[PDB]
Amino acid sequence: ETRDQVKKLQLMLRQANDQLEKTMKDKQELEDFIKQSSEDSSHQISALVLRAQASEILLEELQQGLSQAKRDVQEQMAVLMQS
Amino acid sequence: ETRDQVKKLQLMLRQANDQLEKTMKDKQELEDFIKQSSEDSSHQISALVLRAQASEILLEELQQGLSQAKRDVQEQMAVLMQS
Amino acid sequence: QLNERQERIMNEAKKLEKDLIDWTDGIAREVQDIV
């Protein structure tokens, strides 16, 4: 009965190819989960990064504005001194 | 022909099962990647916390600098006015 | 939480930007009152 054996093997090949199809669909679901998860976390993080660099550029300009403010006040002491 | 056919079917079954094992390996690698991708985003957030600390420290120094500036201009102006 | 402590830094930074101008004008105002 290599004829019954052939029918068995056809069944087993159908079950294996079905299994493959399903596992491939699973893989695709994981790849989609990865993509969705990365897009979300990037959103969050790009926001936090924007806020950080804004803070940084501002505080830089405030170092400047502090020197400059001290300079302005000093020129005011210069004038006050002319008296 | 039942003999040739058995042999062909066994080769095909073997190739299907090898393929299934590789696709399961790939699924496993994607699952591990979801983990690693999570860790990476975390590490990004730690970098961000470092930036926020540097900025708080700078801000604080600028606040102290303004206070000190005011104090010593108050004394300067006091003596310029004691005249 | 970072969104948030980034905005405490942010708020305190803006208040300080204000204090700079407050001080400079306060001084100029006082000096010119002396002339």
Numbering used by the authors:
A (entry chain C), B (entry chain B): 552 to 634
C (entry chain A): 419 to 453
Which statements did the authors publish about this structure?
In this process, small GTPase Rab5 functions as a master regulator of the early endosomal biogenesis. Rabex-5 is a specific GEF for Rab5, Rab17, and Rab21. Rabaptin-5 is a key effector of Rab5 and plays an important role in both homotypic and heterotypic fusions of early endosomes. The GEF activity of Rabex-5 is autoinhibited by its CC domain and is activated by the binding of Rabaptin-5 via its C2-1 domain.
In the structure of the Rabex-5CC-Rabaptin-5C212 complex, the asymmetric unit contains one complex. Rabex-5CC also forms a long α-helix (52 Å) and packs in parallel with the C-terminal regions of Rabaptin-5C212 to form a tight three-helix bundle. The interactions between Rabex-5CC and Rabaptin-5C212 are essentially the same as those in the R2Δ complex. Interestingly, Rabaptin-5C212 assumes a linear conformation in the Rabex-5CC-Rabaptin-5C212 structure but a V-shaped conformation in the R2Δ structure, and in both structures, the C-terminal regions of Rabaptin-5C212 bind one Rabex-5CC and two symmetry-related Rabaptin-5C212 dimerize through the N-terminal regions which are the binding site for GAT.
